[PDB]
Structure 1
C-alpha cells in the first residue's frame, strides 16, 4: 500500500462490480470456463453447474453473435441478451458486450437501463455544436462541465488537464451550489497510477456505479486450462482499487464517471463526473459521454494546432529578421516569449539587462548569469542552491550564450509553479480543509503536489528546447 499501490495490478483483480456479470468463454467448445458470482442469479443456473456449460444453453443472443478472432481483438458493442433457463425473467432488460481474444472470449453484461430514459445525441447536439465553436480550451472546458451535469444528471463534473510529468490540474468544474469547489486544485501524478491512466485511455469511459459495492469474485480466479487471471483491461465491470474507494469514500462520492480527453492519441486530461448518490451509467449515457469527451478533445486539439502554427510563424519571422543585434532581438522579445513560451525574457549585453515579461529584478538575473548546446534547468537550486532564494519568478531557465566576443546572452524564465495558481477563480482553495480522519483527501493531495513541485518551474523543456538552441546555431552569420 501507499508506495506499493503505485504499481497495483488493477487490470487483473479477479473481481468485478456487482451491477454486472462476466463470463470467460473457450472459443473452441464455447464453454464458460470462469464467471462472476453474479452470473448465477442472473442466468438462473447455480455457479457450479454454470462452469463448463456451453454459453448457448444459458444465454440467447438475438443481435450480435461472437466469433473466432485471429490476431488483434474485436470488441462488440452492448446488444440484447436473454436468459433461457431462469423461471421468472429479471426486473430490467439486459445488454451484452463481447471482448474477442484469440485464446478467450470475454462476455460482459449489465442492465440496459435503471428503468430510466436515455439521453439522445439529438439532446447532446446543442452541446456538441457549441463546444466546437468556443474560442480557447478554457471556455469550452467550462461549457462541457456545465452541459454534461445538465445532460447526464450529476452532482459534480470536473475537467482535468495533465501536465508534462502527468500531474493533474482541475481547469473546469460545475457543481451544486450546496457543494464545495475544487476548481484550481492541483494533484500529483502518483494520485492516478500509470496503469490507471492507461486503462482510462484504453476503455474510453470508466464507471464506478456504487463506491462501497460488495465485489463479485470471478470463479475460478484463474483459467482452469490456461492458469491465468482474467485481463479485465477491456471490461468496464472491472472492480476498483481499495485505495481509490478509500479516497472517494472520504469525500462521500458514491459514484463516478470518467471519460478520456484523448488528443493526438495521447491522454490530454479527463472528464470526471462525481455523484454523492449511487448512479449506474448505462451504455447509452456512456456513449453520449464519450461523444462529448471526443468533441471537447477535438476542439482543444484544433486550438492546439492553431497555437502550434503561430509558434512556427513567430519563429519564421525571428529567423527571417535575423537575416537583416541584441536590440534587434529585444524588439522581438514579447514574440521570443512565444516561440519558446516563458513567463519572462532577460537579454544581457554585458552588465545592462532588459527584462520584458515576469522576470526577477535586474540584480537577481546578474547573479544567475555569473553562476553559469545551451544550458537549461527545471529547478534553479538543484544545479546550484546559491540561487535557490529566487526560485519564484525564475525557477526554470534556458541560458543561451550568443558568443564569447560580446557579453551578450539570453535567459528565458518561468515562475515557481505555486505562483501560477488560479486562486482568484475559486477563493475556497486556500481556506479548504482536510478530511477529518483520513490518509487520502483532495486537501491532502494539493499539499503532496505542492511538495513534489516546490522550487520547480512549470516543467517546460519539450520542442521549445532545440527551437531555442537553434538560435545559438543561427548566431553563425
Structure 2
C-alpha cells in the first residue's frame, strides 16, 4: 500500500520507502502538450492544465465551463462511439486535428471509469515492412536481439539503444546494444532489483510505452488538482504526458541523459524485457514515429517466443541417442539401483555433472564425486522440506547456509523427486568454478547505502564464490522428461509387490491352520496315555490278582493303540515341516 501524494499530504520519498510511492498519481504533466478531463456523458470540461490556454489559443475563463460539442464538431460523436462506458482503460483513440492557431495537433483520448482524458501534441518509405521480415528470418536469439537494436536506432536517431532483459530473480542485464561512435559500452553489465521497483513492473505490463523529453524540466500541474466527481486525485495511468517520478529524474541526470524512451516486451502476461533509449541532449520524438515503435514492441513479443523455443529444440538434438537408451531402460527397470548406477548409460554425461546421488528403497548409493557421508544425510533432509517436484540452483551457498563449506564438491544442484514427498530422488552436483561478474556502477549491496542515486556507472568487478556452471534450459526440460518416466514406471513396480504380499498371506494361512489343529489333536492322545497311567496306578496298588491281570497284555494291547497314535503323529509332524 502506497503513501498519499505530496499535494494532499505525504512523506518525502527516499531509498527506504521506494516500494510505496504514488507513481500513477503525480497531478502534473510534462510541458510539451496540454491536458483536459471531461464528463463521460455531458462532455463538460472539469480539469485543465495551466498551459492549455496558450497551447490551444483561447482565454481560460472561456474553456472552463464548455462542452466538447463546441470544441470538436466532427470528433465528439465519433469519440463516443469508439469508447463506450465500462471498457478497459488500456484502450486508446487517436485523431489528427486542424487547429488554426497551433497549426496541427494530434489528439489522444482514453476513459478511466467515468472520466475522459484528453492529450494534445504538435504534429506534421518501406522501413517497417523490411524490418518485419528481418526479424522473422533471424537464426538465433542473440542474432534477433542484434537486428532489433540496429533498426530502432536507424528510425529514431537516438544515441544509445539497448535490449534489456530480466532474470527470473528480477535483476537486469543488457544483452544487445548499438551506439554512436566515441561512447561508452553498457553491454553485459548486470543491474540490481532496486533500480526498477515492483509497482513499476506492475504498471509496465499494462501500459507499454512511456518517455521523458527533458530531465531538467519543471512539472506543470493541474487546476483544479482534485477530481470534481469523486473528490480524489485524478488517475494518469494511461497518460502519455504522465510526469516522471522525481526519484528517477535524478538518476538520469547523474548518468548524463537528456531524453529517455522505453517499450515493454511482454511474453505470456509477464514482463520479459525493455527497449531502453538514451539521448545526451533534450529531444522530442514526433507522435507518428512513436506508433512505428509500438509495432516493433508487439512484433518482438511474438518473435522472442519462437527463437527461445528453437534454441532448446536444437540443443535437444545433440543429446538424442543419449536420451533414447536412458528412457528405454528406466521404464522397464524393477531394480532402480542396479540399472541407473551402471556406467554404460553414463548418467553424469547427460547433465554434464560431477556427482550423482541415487536414492531408492532406503539406501543412498553414490557415483562420481560426492561430499563426505554425514553431510549427504544433512542435504537429503533439506530436500524433504522443499515443496516442489524439481529443485534448480546454481548457488547452494545462499539457499542452504549450513552446506556453504561443501563448495569444492558441490556448488550447483539439480534435483528430481520421483513420486512425492522426496522419498525417492535423483541429485546432480557440479563443482565450484571461479566467477567474475561485471556490474554496471555498483553491486546490489551498495544500492541501499546512498539516500539518492549513485554517481558512478563504470565497470565494477566483484569476486563471487560458491557458483558453478549455470544450467542450460534444455537440460531442465530433459530432466523433467526423465522424472515422468520414473514416476510412470512406478505403476508396474507396485503391481508386483502386491502379488508377493498375496503369496505371504497364503503361507500365514498354513501356519495358523496347522498350528491350531495339530496342537488340539495332540491334547487328546496325551490325555489318553495319562488316563491310562491312571490304570497303571489302579492295578499294582492292590498287589492282588485283578480280573485284568490275565489281560494285562490286552491292556498293553490298548496302549498299543496309543503307541500307534504317536507313531502316526511323528510321521505327520515330519511331513508338515517339509511342506
Does the pair score TM above 0.5? yes
Contact 1:18–1:216 (Cα < 8 Å) also in 2: yes
User: 1:214 aligned to 2:222?
Assistant: no
Task: State the alpha-carbon separation in 2 of the partners of residues 61 and 420 from structure 1.
Answer: 63
Q: 2:291 aligns with which of 287, 290, 296?
A: 287
Which residue does 2:427 correspond to in 1?
410
1:147-296 correspondence to structure 2 within 5 Å: 147-296=151-300
Contact 2:213–2:283 (Cα < 8 Å) also in 1: yes
- How far is the alpha carbon of 1:172 from its aligned partner? 0.9
Instruction: Point out the more displaced range, 96-105 or 192-201.
Output: 192-201
Greater Rg over alpha carbons, structure: 2
User: 1:44 aligned to 2:65?
Assistant: no
Greater percentage in helix: 2
Which residue does 2:19 correspond to in 1?
6
CA RMSD of aligned residues (A): 4.2
Distance 1:390 1:170, change over 3 A: farther
Task: State the alpha-carbon separation in 2 of the partners of residues 131 and 185 from structure 1.
Answer: 25
Which residue does 1:111 correspond to in 2?
122
Q: 1:381 aligns with which of 397, 402, 410?
A: 397
Contact 1:59–1:81 (Cα < 8 Å) also in 2: no
Alignment length, in residue pairs?
438
Task: State the alpha-carbon separation in 1 of the partners of residues 308 and 36 from structure 2.
Answer: 43
Contact 1:94–1:112 (Cα < 8 Å) also in 2: yes
- How far is the alpha carbon of 1:106 from its aligned partner? 0.9
Task: State the alpha-carbon separation in 2 of the partners of residues 392 and 44 from structure 1.
Answer: 74
SS in 2 for 1:147: helix
- How far is the alpha carbon of 1:247 from its aligned partner? 0.4
Which residue does 1:473 correspond to in 2?
487
Task: State the alpha-carbon separation in 2 of the partners of residues 367 and 169 from structure 1.
Answer: 39
Q: 2:68 aligns with which of 55, 59, 77?
A: 55
Distance 1:137 1:394, change over 3 A: farther
Task: State the alpha-carbon separation in 1 of the partners of residues 375 and 134 from structure 2.
Answer: 48
Distance 1:409 1:352, change over 3 A: same
Distance 1:366 1:52, change over 3 A: farther
Task: State the alpha-carbon separation in 2 of the partners of residues 281 and 59 from structure 1.
Answer: 26
Contact 2:53–2:60 (Cα < 8 Å) also in 1: yes
- How far is the alpha carbon of 1:472 from its aligned partner? 6.1
Provide the TM-score with structure 1 as the length reference.
0.77
Task: State the alpha-carbon separation in 1 of the partners of residues 96 and 27 from structure 2.
Answer: 25
Contact 2:371–2:410 (Cα < 8 Å) also in 1: no
Contact 2:45–2:66 (Cα < 8 Å) also in 1: yes
Contact 1:61–1:81 (Cα < 8 Å) also in 2: no
1:78-117 correspondence to structure 2 within 5 Å: 78-83=94-99, 89-90=101-102, 92-113=103-124
Which residue does 2:378 correspond to in 1?
371
Contact 1:78–1:96 (Cα < 8 Å) also in 2: yes
Q: 1:71 aligns with which of 55, 75, 86?
A: 86
Q: 2:330 aligns with which of 322, 328, 332?
A: 322
Instruction: Point out the more displaced range, 378-387 or 169-178.
Output: 378-387
Contact 2:265–2:301 (Cα < 8 Å) also in 1: yes
Query: Per-residue displacement from partner, 1:182-241 (whole Å, max 9, x unpaired)?
Result: 111111222112222233232222111111221121221211122122221111110111
Which residue does 1:303 correspond to in 2?
307
Contact 1:170–1:184 (Cα < 8 Å) also in 2: yes
- How far is the alpha carbon of 1:396 from its aligned partner? 4.7
User: Which structure would you say has the larger RCO, counting Cα contacts within 8 Å and 6 or more residues apart?
Assistant: 1
- How far is the alpha carbon of 1:327 from its aligned partner? 3.8
Query: Per-residue displacement from partner, 1:279-323 (whole Å, max 9, x unpaired)?
Result: 222222212112222222222111233356679997984544422
Task: State the alpha-carbon separation in 1 of the partners of residues 357 and 183 from structure 2.
Answer: 51
SS in 1 for 2:228: coil
Provide the TM-score with structure 2 as the length reference.
0.65
Contact 2:327–2:482 (Cα < 8 Å) also in 1: no
Distance 1:196 1:69, change over 3 A: same
- How far is the alpha carbon of 1:13 from its aligned partner? 0.8
Distance 1:56 1:82, change over 3 A: farther
Distance 1:332 1:64, change over 3 A: farther
Distance 1:369 1:244, change over 3 A: same
SS in 2 for 1:78: strand
Distance 1:189 1:16, change over 3 A: same
Query: Per-residue displacement from partner, 1:383-427 (whole Å, max 9, x unpaired)?
Result: 643432566995552345889xxx9952255978x9374x6xx9x
In structure 2, the gaps of 5 or more residues are 1-13, 333-339, 359-363, 494-579
